[PDB]
């Protein structure tokens, strides 16, 4: 047994040495002379209300107008962000929903949670009511995140250390991603959807190729569990937030953390993160009910979206970057622009 | 100002809002009890009367009061990553077995350790606890030949059935670090399970009332 453990330690040392060898100059040094962004003040253009309990997840439609929000009162509400009208209200079989997703085509939504089942809801039915298209079972723990690739493929990470790519039409998982040490808390698809990154409670993140079915790279640097991930819009980098109260940015090819977003005032964990369309701004929701907008190139606390009473929970910028929605435990989603 | 289609959409949105309000007025009324305990403490036993790999919900109406009981012990995952979902539960039922003195690898101390965490979590400061101490008969029969000292460094004044039970209750209640904000209701079901549900109906009432007294400002 000891020989394989020594081999693993040797491989870890070798990869650490390679990463150090590649670290010629950090991003902060490279970004020294570029001018900072101004004080990013954002007003609450719309306050979406109607949810009765904590908002636990939300997602934007590709049209940048419709958005689905999931709450623990047992409701998925599809809102029209422009007018704040409820487009749909979907009751759930289990009110313990921890995540939700919007199909890129806009036809389907999905959700899951402590029931360990990913329920897919079809919105374009001829009956005129939203009905469960499929219930994906096979995970032995709560679902932490769900993301659509097509109308027939969904990738879901669970709290039993595994992720899975499913064929919705067949109803069974076609690929299973394993290798994490702790509960997989967050997941993010690449812009091209060929790769996706998962963050787990073991403080590590892992990059997976959806078709190859095996992790390609492992990223470390957080001292606590990771609660959120997002892809830098270019798809060559991703930012993660953790309970250690600092966000971090990694580049896939460099295979190490380029920058860190620690702060003095902030002493609490991060629940969600999102990059702005240009990628210059990184938005992150915190446990102290205020989202912070960071200059992703300089890590300056460029702005604060302080408008929530209870722990900030989820947020997302529209696919066209026109606005950012933040849902929080006080049962309100606020849209900022 | 608006198109006809926009006005119809607004009407539909307000219909959805009315439905949401109507369902919320129903969710608040329902009692929600989080069930917890050791692997074989008696959760199955109690569920078997209140019955009349994810979260297991069981619904039952007793004396025109609707209870949803969430048995989550089936989940083998990081507790601190999903426990906060149960902030608003009316109460936490906690099952512990009194025949656990001799089940060393000490399991009684494991039960007290779990009880400490449940009492003193950030989330459950205001959430009351209903402590079901089960299997009294297997403890009444056992105390006569296995003293409390086998598990605890110090025991009651004597290895007497009632004194031992009271001593166990006192220790379990003393783990409450927030006596000013929450109360622990204790039961001693000796397989007299017909009373169990009634107890939960009683204790829960004392919780519900003490919540309303807080909402209207009397407390």
């Amino acid at each position, epitope marked *: 047994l000891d020989q394989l453990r020594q081999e693993a330690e040797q491989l870890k040392n070798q990869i650490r040495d390679a990463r150090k060898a590649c670290a010629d100059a950090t991003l902060s040094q490279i970004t020294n002379n570029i001018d900072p962004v101004g004080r990013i003040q954002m007003r609450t253009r719309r306050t979406l209300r109607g949810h009765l309990a904590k908002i636990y997840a939300m997602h934007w439609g590709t049209d940048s*107008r*419709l958005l689905v929000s999931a709450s623990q009162d047992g409701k998925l509400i599809i809102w*029209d962000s422009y*007018t704040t*009208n409820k*487009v*749909h209200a979907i009751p759930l079989r289990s009110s313990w929903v921890m995540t939700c997703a919007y199909a890129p085509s*806009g036809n389907y939504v999905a959700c899951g949670g402590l029931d360990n089942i990913c329920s897919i809801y079809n919105l*374009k039915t*001829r*009956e*005129g*009511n939203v009905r469960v298209s499929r219930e994906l079972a096979g995970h032995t723990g709560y679902l932490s995140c769900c993301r659509f690739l097509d109308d027939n493929q969904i990738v879901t990470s669970s709290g039993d250390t595994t992720c899975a790519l499913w064929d919705i039409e067949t109803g069974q998982q076609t690929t299973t991603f394993t290798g994490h040490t702790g509960d997989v808390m967050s997941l993010s698809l690449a812009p091209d959807t060929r790769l996706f990154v998962s963050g787990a409670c073991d403080a590590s993140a892992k990059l997976w190729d959806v078709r190859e079915g095996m992790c390609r790279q492992t990223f470390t640097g957080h001292e606590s569990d990771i609660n959120a991930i997002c892809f830098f819009p270019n798809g060559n980098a991703f930012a993660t937030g953790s309970d250690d109260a600092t966000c971090r940015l990694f580049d896939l090819r460099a295979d190490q953390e380029l920058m860190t977003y620690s702060h003095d005032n902030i002493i609490c964990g991060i629940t969600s993160v999102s990059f702005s369309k240009s990628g210059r701004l990184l938005l992150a929701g915190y446990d102290d009910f205020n989202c912070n907008v960071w200059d992703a190139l300089k890590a300056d606390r460029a702005g604060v979206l302080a408008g929530h009473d209870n722990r900030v929970s989820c947020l997302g910028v529209t696919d066209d970057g026109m606005a950012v929605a933040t849902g929080s435990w006080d049962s309100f989603l606020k849209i900022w622009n | 100002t608006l*198109s*006809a*289609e*926009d*006005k*119809a*959409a607004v*009407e*539909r*949105s307000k*219909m959805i809002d009315r439905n949401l309000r109507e369902d919320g007025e129903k969710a608040a009324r329902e009692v929600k009890l989080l069930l917890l305990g050791a692997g074989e403490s008696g959760k199955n036993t109690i569920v078997k009367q209140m019955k009349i790999t994810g979260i297991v919900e069981t619904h039952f109406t007793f004396k025109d009061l609707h209870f949803k009981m969430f048995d989550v012990g089936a989940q083998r995952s990081e507790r601190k990553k999903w426990i906060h979902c149960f902030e608003g539960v009316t109460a936490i039922i906690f099952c512990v077995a009194l025949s656990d003195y001799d089940l060393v690898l000490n399991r009684m101390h494991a039960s007290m350790k779990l009880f400490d965490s449940i009492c003193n979590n950030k989330w459950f400061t205001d959430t009351s606890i209903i402590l079901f101490l089960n299997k009294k008969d297997l403890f009444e029969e056992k105390i006569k030949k296995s003293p409390l000292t086998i598990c605890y460094p110090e025991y009651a004044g004597s290895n007497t059935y009632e004194e031992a039970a009271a001593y166990i209750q006192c220790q379990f209640e003393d783990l409450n670090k927030r006596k000013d904000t929450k109360e622990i209701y204790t039961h001693f079901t000796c397989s007299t399970d017909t009373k169990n549900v009634q107890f939960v109906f009683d204790a829960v009432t004392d919780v519900i009332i003490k919540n309303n007294l807080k909402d209207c400002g009397l407390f």
Partner: single-chain antibody
Amino acid sequence: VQLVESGGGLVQPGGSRKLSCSASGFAFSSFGMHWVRQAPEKGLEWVAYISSGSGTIYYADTVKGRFTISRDDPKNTLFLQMTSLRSEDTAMYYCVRSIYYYGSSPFDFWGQGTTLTVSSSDIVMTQATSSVPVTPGESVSISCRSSKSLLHSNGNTYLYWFLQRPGQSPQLLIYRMSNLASGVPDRFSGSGSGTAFTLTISRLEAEDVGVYYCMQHLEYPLTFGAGTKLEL
């Protein structure tokens, strides 16, 4: 999905009657409903509308006060009471469902129709021609014009294109002037300039022949066109 009207037959001028249609195969409780009439030979004419939950009930000035629309969601039925009938009321009557929300497709489904034989400021919509000749495999366009610009401030151009084949109920082809309805082949397309619109068919196929009707949904007194006939 299925809509079936009943209560048809002959009626005496100036009397009263009930029509009803039974909704099936869909959540009638959530859909708004329309009654639309068609004189024996001439084009469609909007009769009445009831929004889901009966929160909104609108009538055409031609019938307002004489007709009354109602719905029974528990029985999934729609009713139309009529009093003081006149010769102008003799017509086929269709029930059309319509669900209104962002991206919805109102007027998608039409009932079979019930015949009622009576014994013996609005937006004006015009269509270019009463008839147009066509043959299979050809490309054919149909024009339309409106009294007011349908392009609303919110950017939606509220024009609808329906096709009625001889003997069948009208079917929604295009909604809001560019959006093809579900099940409509790619042959059909639509465009317009706010006040002038057009619908085009490529590789025209058999069974496409019939009457093409326009409709505006910018203002509640909905108005149809004269109908353009396409024949082999």
